[PDB]
Scaffold this active site. Sequence first.
Site, PDB file in Angstrom:
ATOM      1  N   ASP A 186       0.990  -0.996   0.124  1.00 55.27           N
ATOM      2  CA  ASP A 186       0.019  -0.255  -0.027  1.00 55.27           C
ATOM      3  C   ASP A 186       0.932   1.418   0.375  1.00 55.27           C
ATOM      4  OD1 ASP A 186       0.266  -1.262   2.131  1.00 55.27           O
ATOM      5  OD2 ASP A 186      -0.188   1.272   2.950  1.00 55.27           O
ATOM      6  N   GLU A 246      -2.335  -0.266   6.518  1.00 55.94           N
ATOM      7  CA  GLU A 246      -1.063   0.727   7.045  1.00 55.94           C
ATOM      8  C   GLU A 246      -1.683   0.881   8.925  1.00 55.94           C
ATOM      9  OE1 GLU A 246      -3.184   4.775   5.536  1.00 55.94           O
ATOM     10  OE2 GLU A 246      -1.503   4.677   5.591  1.00 55.94           O
TER      11      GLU A 246
END
Length: 422
Positions: A87, A150
């Site tokens: 990501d 995250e």
Amino acid sequence: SMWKEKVQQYEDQIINDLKGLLAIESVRDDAKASEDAPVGPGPRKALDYMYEIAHRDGFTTHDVDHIAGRIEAGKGNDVLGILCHVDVVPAGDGWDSNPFEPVVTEDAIIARGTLDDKGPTIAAYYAIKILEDMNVDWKKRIHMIIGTDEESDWKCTDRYFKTEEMPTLGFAPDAEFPCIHGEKGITTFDLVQNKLTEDQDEPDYELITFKSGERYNMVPDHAEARVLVKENMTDVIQDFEYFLEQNHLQGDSTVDSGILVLTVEGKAVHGVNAGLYLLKFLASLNLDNNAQAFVAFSNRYLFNSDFGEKMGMKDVTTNIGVITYDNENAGLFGINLRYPEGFEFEKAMDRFANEIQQYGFEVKLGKVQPPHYVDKNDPFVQKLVTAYRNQTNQKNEYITKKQLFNATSIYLEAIYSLCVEE
């Protein structure tokens, strides 16, 4: 630099795959999420992209709810874990390029995620591949674990590790408490006796003091019990010697004016607990109420439970490192307890503390430090730093071709020595 020029041969392939990965705009989109793409479409495709190149190269993969997964290599009981992320944070405004259109300079690759974490992901990956291309005879499995969220910190409590095997060793740059084996957890606590303030007839034997042990984390190598003897001195001295003989122990006794001093040697570390054996001898005698309960408690819970069994907590590990008793205060045991990741110490101490009150004893626990990873002590992490040394002296984000191939050759070294032995 046999490593370094081994990476020279894979240069085109590395840049090509990195380009593929960089071209995917794997930025978090919580508004567009769904069961199929729990943090957005972007990151989902980047995860799949890793699976494709792995399948292209013959590796097995395993997906977890489409938010994280792993690429598997090698064989053996131990698994080395390399954790990373595909990501990517958004492009701040005003770049001098398109952040998701990788530009390939003469000596650099420019795009978002070139530095964190797509460059390093590809570097790590190609290490495993190149070793696979050389038909190496693997001694450890490898799990290259790839995340897209995250908000995870790779905790044992976060999604991936909720269900997936823990690496036995590994590397996780960003994480503070990644779910990777390292240091065992630790607590210390006391078992404190309630002194029963009750009159009684004069016992054959009265325990005046007991002492064994200096530190919570050392096996006491010494024990001394001092005992007021009412009538028969000769039998207890004979039995003590027989006890020493039967348990292969050193010790002795001293007598003065009806006070018998019994002393046991044992072997230390952190190899025989002297105090526990001495209490075991004392349980054969008719003692005063309090010494008897104190001696009996050690026999019921402590004697020959190196591994927690008698406390029903068992590798978990228990050391009885401090043992005192006097008439005044009535004695206590200071316990040290080590445990691996995945033991439930809360509910364990709960069932114990509750079960013990039966015998006028109570837990007073000290600080508890849970199991956890220590980078600087990780065997892999060290081999990596050894290989840097051995080898090396967000807007317009770029990575050097030289950092890129340096990284690869560094994972290559470290991984090789740890998985194909060196």
